[PDB]
Amino acid sequence: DGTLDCISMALTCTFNRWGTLLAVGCNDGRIVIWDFLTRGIAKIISAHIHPVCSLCWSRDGHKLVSASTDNIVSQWDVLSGDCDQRFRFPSPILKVQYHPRDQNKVLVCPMKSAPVMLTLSDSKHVVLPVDDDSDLNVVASFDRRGEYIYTGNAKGKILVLKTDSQDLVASFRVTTGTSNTTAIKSIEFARKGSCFLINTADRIIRVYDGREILTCGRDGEPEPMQKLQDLVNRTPWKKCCFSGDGEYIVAGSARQHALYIWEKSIGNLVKILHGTRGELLLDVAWHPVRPIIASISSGVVSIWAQNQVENWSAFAPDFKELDENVEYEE
Amino acid sequence: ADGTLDCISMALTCTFNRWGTLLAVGCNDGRIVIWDFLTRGIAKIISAHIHPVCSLCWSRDGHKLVSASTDNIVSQWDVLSGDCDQRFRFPSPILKVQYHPRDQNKVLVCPMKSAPVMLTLSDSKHVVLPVDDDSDLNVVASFDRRGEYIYTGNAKGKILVLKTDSQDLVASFRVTTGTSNTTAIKSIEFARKGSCFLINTADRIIRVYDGREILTCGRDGEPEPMQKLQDLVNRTPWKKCCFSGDGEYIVAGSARQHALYIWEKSIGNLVKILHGTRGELLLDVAWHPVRPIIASISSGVVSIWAQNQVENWSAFA
Amino acid sequence: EPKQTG
C-alpha cells in the first residue's frame, strides 16, 4: 500500500507513543528511526552487531530498549544515539518491554529461562514466578497501567502477578474446548481500556477483559470476550495487536502474507490486506492514534493507511508536496 | 465544459498545530480544511464562514481553532466536532487573530481600522489596548512567546510593549530607516524558542530583536536590531515571515516572485531560496514547529516543502 | 547557497 524505500533488512518495528516516529530494528543490528512528518529518517543507531529482534519505546519517548540475538539487552538515548546501559543474559531474548508508567523498569523474556524484571538505575532484578516449573518458554506482558504482569507458558497457563510484589492474584488455563492444553505464543494489551488478547498454538485469538480475569481469581475459568480464527484456511498468526483505541484487532498471517482485521466488540472480519505473494511476514504494528498499520515482510516496511471519506469527493484545495532528499546526518 | 472548478476550494491561509501533525487551511468558500501529516490526506473539513477566511490560530491544547472571515466575524471552532463555540461581529475587517499562547481563554484580534482588542471568551469581555499618536489605522500586534506581553506596531513605526493582564506600557521604541524616516510596521512574529522576534516593515527589511534587550530599554528606548535581513539584489518586499521552530532560521515569502528566502538568524546569512512555480501569487507561509518543513499557499494551492533524510543506497539489477 | 525550483 506504500513501502518505505529508505529502510532495508527490516525485522521488527514499533511506534512511539504519539506515532510520529517508527523505530525499525534491522537484520544488520541497526535501529533506524523513520519520521512520519518529514517522511524520512530521523535517527540511526548502531545498536548491535547481531540482528535486532525486539524494541520498545519509553513512555517519555526519549529511550529505546532493544534485544539482539547475542542475548544483549540495551537502552538507547534516541536523541544522542548513546547507550545508557547494557545487559547480557544467558539464553536469547524473545521480548523486551518498558513498564508503561515507569521507564526505570524493563521486562525481559528469555527463551529458556523465566521472565526477569530489571531496574536500570540500580542494576537489580527479579525473576518472576512460574507455574509448571518446566515452563521454559514463557512470554509476559505488563498490562496497560503496569500494575500487573501477565504470563503464558507452553501448557496454556496464564499467571496474573502483581508487578510490585510478584504475587499470584489470578490464574487460569486456556482451553482447547476438548481439554488438551494449547501453547501461548504472545500476550498483547490494548492502549485504551482493559482488554488483552492471546495468540495460541491452536490458531484462535482469544480476547479477554482484564477485569474479568482479576474477578475470576486464582485458578478460574474466565470466558473469552471474543474468539477470532480463520475457519476457511485455519491460518496461523505471526503477530496480533489492537488498534490504538482498542476496538479493532489485526493479525498477520505469514503463511499467506495477509493481515486480518476484526471488530473486537461484535467479532466479524472487517477486511483483509494482501501484500505480495513472494514475501514472508515478519512484524505488524498498529498506529497508536490513526488508522495506520505498519508491516514488515522480507525486510521491507509497508505502511497501510486510510484517509477519511473526502480527499476529493469533497472538492478540497489542492495539496502538493515538494520533498528534498538530504543525506542523513547526526 | 466546466463544473468542478466552481466548487473546488482555494486555500488562502494556513497554520500548524503545536506539534505539527495537523495543518489548518482556510479557504475562499469559508471552509476550514484540516490536513493530517500522519496520513498525508484530509482529516476534517469545517463549514465555518459564509465568506473567505483570512486568519486562523490553533489553541495550545489542539482542540480549538480561532478564525476570522471577511465578514468581520471572529469565530471559535471545536475541531473534533466541527461546531462553532462562539462568534463575534466586528466593525471594519480583521487582519489577524491569535490565541494567548498559555491561556486559550484570551484572544487578540487586530482590526484594520481600529486598535487591537483582547477578548476573554468564558464571558466575552473585550478590552481595547492603548495606541500611540492615534495613527490607529493598521495596528498589528502579537503576544510574545509566553504571553506575558503584547507587542504592538503601527504605521509610523512605533512599537509598544504592554503587560498582558494590566495593559500597562512597559517599553516602547520607534524603528527608523537609514534616513531617519519612519516606516510602517506590517507584521510582528515571535520565535517558539528563546526571546527573539522579528518585524516586517514597509522598507522591505526584516528586523530581528531580542525582547530582553527591549524591556531593558524601557519607554522610548533605542534598541538596535540584532539582524537586518533583505533582498540585496532585487529589493523584493516581503508578504509574510516567521521563524523556524528552534528560532535559528527565518523564512520570508516574496510578494513579487513565488519565492521563499531562508536566512540563518545568528549570522544573518541567506542559505537558500525556494522557487515556486513561476507566475503564482504567494498568500501564506508557515514554518513547521518541530521539523524542517515549510507550508506555503500560492494561488489557492498548498505546498509542503520538506527535507527528508535518506541514505545513499539504490538498486542495481 | 542553493536554489530549488518547481
Residue numbers in the entry:
A (entry chain A): 18 to 347
B (entry chain B): 17 to 333
C (entry chain C): 361 to 366
Paper's wording?
The multi-protein complex WRAD, formed by WDR5, RbBP5, Ash2L and Dpy30, binds to the MLL SET domain to stabilize the catalytically active conformation required for histone H3K4 methylation. RbBP5 is central to MLL catalytic activation, by making critical contacts with the other members of the complex. The amino terminus of RbBP5, residues 1–325, is composed of a series of canonical WD40 repeats that are predicted to form a seven bladed β-propeller domain, which is the major structural feature of the protein. However, it is the region immediately following this domain, residues 340–380, that stimulates methyltransferase activity through cooperative interactions with the other members of WRAD complex and the MLL SET domain.
After screening a wide range of constructs, diffracting crystals of the RbBP51–380 construct were obtained, which contains both the β-propeller and the regions known to interact with other members of the MLL complex. The structure was determined by molecular replacement, for details see ‘Materials and Methods’ section, and refined to a resolution of 2.5Å. The asymmetric unit contains two copies of the construct, and data collection and refinement statistics are presented in Table 1. The β-propeller domain structure is basically consistent between both copies, but the 325–380 region is largely disordered and varies significantly. The two copies of the β-propeller are linked in the crystal structure due to a strand swap which disrupts the seventh blade of the copy B propeller. RbBP5 forms a canonical seven bladed WD40 repeat β-propeller in which the seventh blade is formed from three anti-parallel strands from the C-terminal region of the domain and is completed with a strand originating from the N-terminus of the domain. Between the third and fourth strands of the 5th propeller blade there is an insert which includes a short α-helix, which lies on one face of the propeller toward the rim. A conspicuous feature of the RbBP5 β-propeller, which appears to be quite distinct from other WD40 proteins in chromatin modification complexes such as WDR5 in MLL and EED and RbAp48 in PRC2, is that the central axis is not formed from bulky aromatic side chains, but instead polar residues dominate the propeller axis. On the ‘top’ face, defined as the face containing the α-helical insert, the propeller axis has a complete ring of basic side-chains, which extends into a basic groove between blades six and seven, and so reaches toward the edge of the propeller.
